[PDB]
Structure formats: structure tokens, C-alpha cells
A paper describes a structure:
The P domains of GII.9 (AY038599), GII.23 (KT290889), GII.27 (MG495077), GVIII (AJ844470), and GX (MF373609) were expressed in E.coli. The five P domains were structurally equivalent with a root mean square deviation for C-alpha atoms ranging between 0.586 Å (GII.23-GII.27) and 1.645 Å (GII.9-GX). The cross-reactivity of the P domains was determined using direct ELISA with a broad-spectrum human norovirus Nanobody (Fc-NB26) that binds to a highly conserved region on the P domain. Fc-NB26 bound to GII.9, GII.23, and GII. P domains in a dose-dependent manner at concentrations less than 80 ng/mL. Structural modeling of the Fc-NB26-binding site indicated that GII.9, GII.23, and GII. P domains contained most of the equivalent residues that could interact with Fc-NB26. Our cumulative data show that Fc-NB26/NB26 binds most GII genotypes, and the epitope is vulnerable and a therapeutic target region for GII noroviruses.
Noroviruses are highly contagious, infecting both humans and animals. The human norovirus capsid protruding (P) domain binds histo-blood group antigen (HBGA) co-factors for infection, and a recently discovered bat norovirus (GX) was also found to interact with HBGAs. In this study, we determined the P domain structures of four human noroviruses and one bat norovirus using X-ray crystallography to examine structural features linked to potential interspecies transmission. The principal structural difference was a variable length P2 subdomain loop (Loop A), which was located near the HBGA pocket.
Author numbering:
A (entry chain A): 224 to 533
B (entry chain B): 225 to 533
Write the structure that this text describes.
Amino acid sequence: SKPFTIPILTIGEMTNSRFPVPIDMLHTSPTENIVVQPQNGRCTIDGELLGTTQLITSNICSFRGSISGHEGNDDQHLWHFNITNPNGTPFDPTEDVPAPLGTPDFRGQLYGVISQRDREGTPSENNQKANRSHQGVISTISPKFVPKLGSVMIGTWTTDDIKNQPSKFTPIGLNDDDNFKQWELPNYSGALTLNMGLAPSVFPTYPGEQILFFRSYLPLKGGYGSPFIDCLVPQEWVAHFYQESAPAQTDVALIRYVNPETGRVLFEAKLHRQGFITVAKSGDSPINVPANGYFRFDSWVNQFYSLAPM
Amino acid sequence: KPFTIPILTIGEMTNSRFPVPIDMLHTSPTENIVVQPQNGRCTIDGELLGTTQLITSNICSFRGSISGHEGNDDQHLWHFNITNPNGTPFDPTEDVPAPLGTPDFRGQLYGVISQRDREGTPSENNQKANRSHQGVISTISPKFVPKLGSVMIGTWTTDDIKNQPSKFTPIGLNDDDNFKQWELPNYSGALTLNMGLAPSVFPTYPGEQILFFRSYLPLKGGYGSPFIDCLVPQEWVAHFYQESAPAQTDVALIRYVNPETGRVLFEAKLHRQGFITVAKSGDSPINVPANGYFRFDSWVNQFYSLAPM
Ligand SMILES: [Cl-]
Ligand SMILES: [Cl-]
Ligand SMILES: [Cl-]
């Protein structure tokens, strides 16, 4: 059987699988009263992509397609954004997926830039294509956020310079974090319709364990705070497992966090086949590890393995 | 154990010179240009060169703090002190051209500057204030001196910028005609030569051209379809860096394969320095499947005669 392996990249060499930014830190805390069911950054350790997970970091929380019309009443200009697969073909809602791959998996106000390049050249400019880019916000809580049905709504404040043309949304952060709920899924089909094709929720089963997350802070357009988003594995682990597809000889890999300079093991954890990590820790306190550290696969165990306290 | 290349498709990889997906393969004659990019430079045995770092989202990004302002008619320019990507002060005596990820082209880099203030606000439960706005970083300005620790960012008529910690996230370009992807900026400004460079690359074998991975870039406005060509995808940089596989010879023979049909489509040389050549003359459509990827075949040398692509 092909040996299972984990990337040796450091935290400072990897990206969050739920938002296209570097990982800032490891994080663990109790999650008994939250449902942990993210849809980006979901890959089994034997290489099966789940949820809305795709391979390209820059496509996480990005949309592409075209603007078809203005809806903008009071407050701001609003635009109807027909979205397509990341490769440009029409999204098929009968696929067993929640929404087009990379769609955001949280409730909040996604801030970024919409860029357009027109589909036909301009005859008075030697047939070159016209372009425009402006800031925009995509509310993932709007009743018009229906990515599974092929469209979302984007607002551009007082900017009216948006055409009915091919468009891409590149995420930057959040408009505000007033109601940012990273563990609450949006309605991918809007009001009164349940989500489908979901990666399952994850939780520790063994007494005394918590999930270990990879955390990144997010920029804000305005207001106050230091919002953050937690992923189950880095995006580079998704791409590694997807390519390697090593057989999972049991459903739990024992992994150790190591300092390659000193050669010493710092702590150990369980990497569950479903694609998430648990550790033996109670509470939320500083995780004192070196910047050069990374996880190494040690051996195949099971869900009843008793980890050393982290 | 042996030498491997990622099996990711073009549609699963990112440009190593700008944080966007790869759109297509490209080859054309380059005898009259100097191909010396500084991002996306990694030897096949894992040595990072130039300004190359590992994270796609840090390519063409800067972080640091704003420290000053200059008016320009009704427009605003800001002094942006930059640090290493990990936040520590950049040491210009290091044998690198500039902080890792600094742009490697002359152009008007368009993106968004985001700030989060250093100290909290008591009236907001000691939370930090934030703001983000569009900006342009000219890589041709005399004030573009990243090797010396700073660049200048313009925000048009927006004056809502503080002397606070800041990050610039790139989106694309402000114009097409002044974007020269093969002309390096002056990392130390006027009258000072660049240092720590990854070397220029070129085909030595008669009849060969460099094969590039091309992406189109967004524009803030105006006309055009600008593009940027990298030598290998960013995911190849990360693969070679981790694997650090010994280069048995200085040239790997690689074949582009369709995994569904199992058939080889064309072959190429992957040079140890970190670039690909093909036997082709001219620039014409490269007709390959979207599912295709390169596979290492064998170790050869610079005199291997490739089949015509
Ligand atoms: Cl054009
Ligand atoms: Cl379990
Ligand atoms: Cl804060």
C-alpha cells in the first residue's frame, strides 16, 4: 500500500482552506455547543473531496460568471450575478454538491473586488476589450444568495459602473463582522429550502478531546474587530491527499507535531480519515509551538487511542 | 522516492507570478527578450531563487505599515513601509532582490490596502478599528524601493488611510500599455542595480522555445487583455521545495499525458534550473486536453533531441 504522508510545509508556508489567506496559528477550544460543518477545506485523508471543496487557493470564496441586470434600489446599487463552475461551464444543480465549488460556507458579508472584461471587443478601440473593477459585497444571508440555483447578488455602494458582462469576484475579507457566523452555513438555495450535498459535521468522540483548527484573521472593510476563520486542514493538505490518494489503513492516523531543527516531537494528535484533527486538551489557551513545526504521520491507530495531553 | 511532478491539471494550479489560476500553456520565440522573472523560481531539487516564497496568496502582496502622506492635486499617495511576509523587519543585506513575493515586473499594480489599527478602541470594547480601500502601487516610481524597505501606494481621492499596520492584496493592473512583464523593476530605485537575482533563462538547443504557464489579469479600467507568464506553477514550486529530490542529471525528460486515455501528447525538457523547453517554432494554439499534466519520464541531458511539439 502506498504510504500515507502529510506535507512538511510550515504554517507560514500554507493557506487557509476556507479563505485565501495564510494560516496565522493553530487553535483549539471546546465546540460542544456549535455544529462544525464547514464545506470548504473538506477532503478525506485518502483523497476524496467533499462539500464545495476544490483545489485552487485563489478560487476559495471566489465566483465567476456574468452580471445580467441591476436590482439596486435604496442604500446602494445591487447587481444580479449569474455564476458558473470555476472553469466557466454552467453549474448543474442536480450534482450532489451544495453549490459551485469554492462558494463561501459561512453567514456574513463577503467583501472583495468585482472585475469585468467585456465579451466582445470595442470597434472604436481597435477591437480591444473594455474592462472595469470595483469593490463589492456579496451578502451570503440575502434571499438572493442562491448559488445552488446559479446566482448571487453583489452590491457596489454608489458605484454604477458595472456592465452586463463577464465578471469575477476576488475576495478580500468581510464588509463588517456584525453578524459573521463562521459555523452557520448559508442557504445555498435561499429561503425555506434545505442544503444538500454536504460534507458531514465533525466532532470529537473520545472523552477529553477537542478539534484542532488552522486559524486565519480576516481583513475588514470597516468597523471594529479582528474576525477569524478556522479550517480543518490547510489547503495544501487538500491538494496533497487528493493527489496521493494513499489508502487509509485504519480510520485514524496518529500524527506528531515536530520541530525539524531540533528533531524533537512537541505533541501528538489524531488525524481522522474524514479529514479533521483532534487533540487531548480542555480549554482555549496559547499553543506554544515553533514557527518551523509541522505534522508527521507516525502510525495507524483507532478512535480509542489515548493521546498524551497537549 | 524518485523524481515526481504534481499530477494537478492547469485548472488545479496557480500562476507563480500572480495569485490567479493558470489559464493556458504558451510558447513563443524569446530570442529578443530577457526572461528573468524573480517569482516562480525554484530549482527542480528544491532551491528557492529570486523573490520566490511558498504561499500563492503572498505573491505580489506586501505587508507593513503606512507612515506618511503626500498630496498630488486632489489625489493621495502614502509611504508604505514593508516587512518580510512573516512580519519581521526585512534585512537588505540578505542575498535576495527584495522582500519575498515583491512583484517582478514594471507596471501599475492594482489591489486593496487593508488596515487594522495597532491599539484597541475603548468605546468598542478595546477592539481594533479597520478600513480597506483600493490602491495602486507603481513598480516604476522612484519611490518603489522594496529592497530599501518601502513602496508608495496611491488611493486616488480616498483620504481614509491612517499610519497603521497594513496589507496590500493584489487584484490586477491599473493599465495595459505600461505593464512590461519581462522588465524587472528597480528594487532599490534610481541608479542602483538589482541584486540577488535568479538568473535569466533561455533555450540553448537549436529549435527549442521556453514553455510558459499563462494567466490573464484583471484591469481596473480601460482596454486590453494583459497576461503574465510563469516558468512553473506555484504548486510545482511547493512540490520541489518539499521533495528536494536529487537531480540525477541537469535535464528531466517530461511527457504531457492525458490520464483518461493514458496517451502521451508531447514531450519537453525540464531543466534543473526550473524551466521547461519544447521543440516548437512560433506561437500557435497548443491543443491539449484540460485533464492533462506533465509526468517525469527519465533523466537526459541538454543535447536530447525532442520530438516536435
Ligand atoms: Cl483586448
Ligand atoms: Cl471519531
Ligand atoms: Cl480586535
